[PDB]
Design a protein around this nucleic acid. Structure first.
Length: 137
DNA sequence: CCAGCGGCAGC
DNA sequence: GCTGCGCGCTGG
């Protein structure tokens, strides 16, 4: 499954290949604008390129990178814990993992797996993409 | 100046 | 269903 590129340019469209990177991206977009979050995401992924590296990280260093975005301490710790469960838990859907709710899970089911038709998103940009996929079907 | 808006866990 | 986290942002 390859999610097609849309006129909306969701960051999920480029990160679908690595579910961990796609899910980290949804964490960055939790109550934070893409214009603000996305530049910082590329810096985080430079310092922490995988779940293996991120799970062994000190949350205070992650928090320092998130500081300009807000929700910097809560998400720094969430990132470390999610990355640990991502690797240790037997999960089929990422909603099973700490820090991933409906929005990250709907993102995973539309971009990482071919399950877009069974998904009912309730997040603006995600809805624009999903509605577009139902249209250009 | 100042108030409201944009995920998720844990209660 | 309620709260808290936390900044930038927009509106007047």
């Amino acid at each position: 499954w390859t999610p097609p590129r849309s006129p909306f340019n969701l960051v999920q469209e480029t990160l679908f290949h690595d579910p961990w990177k796609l899910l980290i991206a949804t964490i960055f977009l939790n109550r934070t604008s893409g214009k603000m979050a996305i530049p910082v995401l590329w810096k985080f992924l430079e310092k922490y390129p995988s779940a293996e590296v991120a799970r062994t990280a000190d949350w205070r260093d992650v928090s320092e990178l998130l500081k300009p975005l807000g929700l910097y301490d809560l998400r720094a710790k969430t990132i470390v814990k999610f990355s640990d469960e991502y690797l240790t838990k037997q999960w089929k859907y990422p909603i099973e993992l700490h820090g991933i709710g409906k929005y990250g899970n709907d993102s995973y089911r539309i971009f990482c797996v071919n399950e877009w038709k069974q998904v009912h998103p309730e997040a603006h940009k995600l809805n624009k993409y999903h509605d577009w996929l139902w249209e250009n079907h």
